Amino acid sequence: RNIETQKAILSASYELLLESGFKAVTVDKIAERAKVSKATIYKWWPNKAAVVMDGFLSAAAARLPVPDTGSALNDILIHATSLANFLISREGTIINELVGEGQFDSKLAEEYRVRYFQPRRLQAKQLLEKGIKRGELKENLDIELSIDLIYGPIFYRLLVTGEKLDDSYVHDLVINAFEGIRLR
Amino acid sequence: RNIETQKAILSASYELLLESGFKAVTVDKIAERAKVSKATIYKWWPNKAAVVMDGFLSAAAARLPVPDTGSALNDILIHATSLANFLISREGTIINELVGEGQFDSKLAEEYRVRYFQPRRLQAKQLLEKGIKRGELKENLDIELSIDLIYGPIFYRLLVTGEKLDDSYVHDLVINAFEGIRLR
User: Fold this and answer.
1) Domain locations in chain B?
2) CATH number attached to the domain at B1-47
């Protein structure tokens, strides 16, 4: 109901996150910075991961535009490139850190799976489902696996390999996920 | 030269890693546990990440067998499944933790990239190069990108999604990376 209160709590959580890192954030510290009580915070968020996640999503331009180019390929290309561009952004670099912490904190992982990753994957599903009903995609396509083929390499590059995640790489990745490695 | 000394240092580093986690390991602690001097350790390893990485690789069955089924598909299937099976193993679960820490410690990331990930990717390259000279793969195949299509989804599942990484998933993943999502 109170948008100013919600804003203060969310700004405080993100400020603390950037200043000190995830592990050091506590609900008490957020309450202190936001000048609200813990009970108020617990009106809207049960735990520190939930509030920090909403703080991040509030502060960053994480919501991707929805292409409708009439082409599954060119739709996914724009989607994946816009995702990759977010991830390399200063704001997007928080994702590394959160996923890193999430290897040790399943509460945080639950939060990013439902609040960050699910909505973006949903968008990708919507573009693929256009392609299916357009009759341009595989017979009995496994949508979720197909999204794994595009997203997987993206996040693998971001988290593991440390290689350059640029438009040209993402272009090649999308095409090759569409063509497959088998000779045609 | 001294295999017993090397063994003691490597066992100590892995013991400390399992007991206390990566961040708490120090070269001093390894020296203490192994009953050797820091100077001895620094005969073979400059830093804690290097020694902990070799400790891990020494203790775990991380070296994958090399299929030669005369089929790029069935070769990669066996490779990727054996990798996935390692990753879900008790020993393999250390990879999550190391990559997690590696988001904050580039020294560790350098170590796992060259000592763990590179050799496995090399093996995958060798299987794909058989397929290319067999004339069963794509015209002008980008080998490294192709490995990204298989490995990426694997590590994405392991690190981000928390979904079940089983033989059947890996099977579907490999086939779909071979077929592509575009209608044939």
Assistant:
1) 1-47, 48-184
2) 1.10.10.60
- Helix ranges (DSSP H) in chain B: 3-20, 27-34, 38-44, 48-59, 72-88, 94-102, 106-112, 118-133, 143-156, 167-179
- Which residues are CB-neighbours of B98 under 8 A, at least 6 positions away? B22, B53, B56, B108, B112
Asked if A81 and A171 touch (Cβ cutoff 8 Å), the reply is: yes
Contacts of A152 in chain B (CB under 8 A): 149, 152-157
CATH node for B48-184: 1.10.357.10
Closest residue in B to A169 (Cα–Cα): B145
**Contact yes or no for A155 and B151 at CB 8 A:** no
Q: Determine the residue of chain B that is closest to A112 in CA distance.
A: B160
- Identify which of B97, B155, B180 has the shortest CB distance to residue A179: B180
Give SS3 for B89. coil
In this complex, do A101 and B100 lie within 8 Å of one another by their Cβ atoms?
Answer: yes
Task: Determine, for residues B146 and A182 on separate chains, whether the beta-carbon distance falls below 8 Å.
Answer: no
- Please give the resolution of this entry in Å, rounded to 1 decimal: 1.8
Whole-angstrom Cα distance, residue B46 to residue B175? 42
Distance CA(A39)–CA(A31), nearest Å, equals 9
A76, A150 contact by CB (below 8 A):
yes
B137 DSSP β-pair partners: A182
Take residue B78 and report the two structure tokens written for it.
């066996």
For residues B149 and B130, give the distance between their C-alpha atoms in angstroms, rounded to a whole number: 18
Helices A143-156 and B143-156 cross at an angle (nearest 10°) of 110
Instruction: Give yes or no for a contact between B16 and B25, defined as CB atoms under 8 angstroms apart.
Output: yes
- Chain A residues close to B173, C-beta within 8 Å: 145, 148-149
| Contact partners, residue A74, CB within 8 Å, separation at least 6 | A67
CA distance B70 to A88: 41
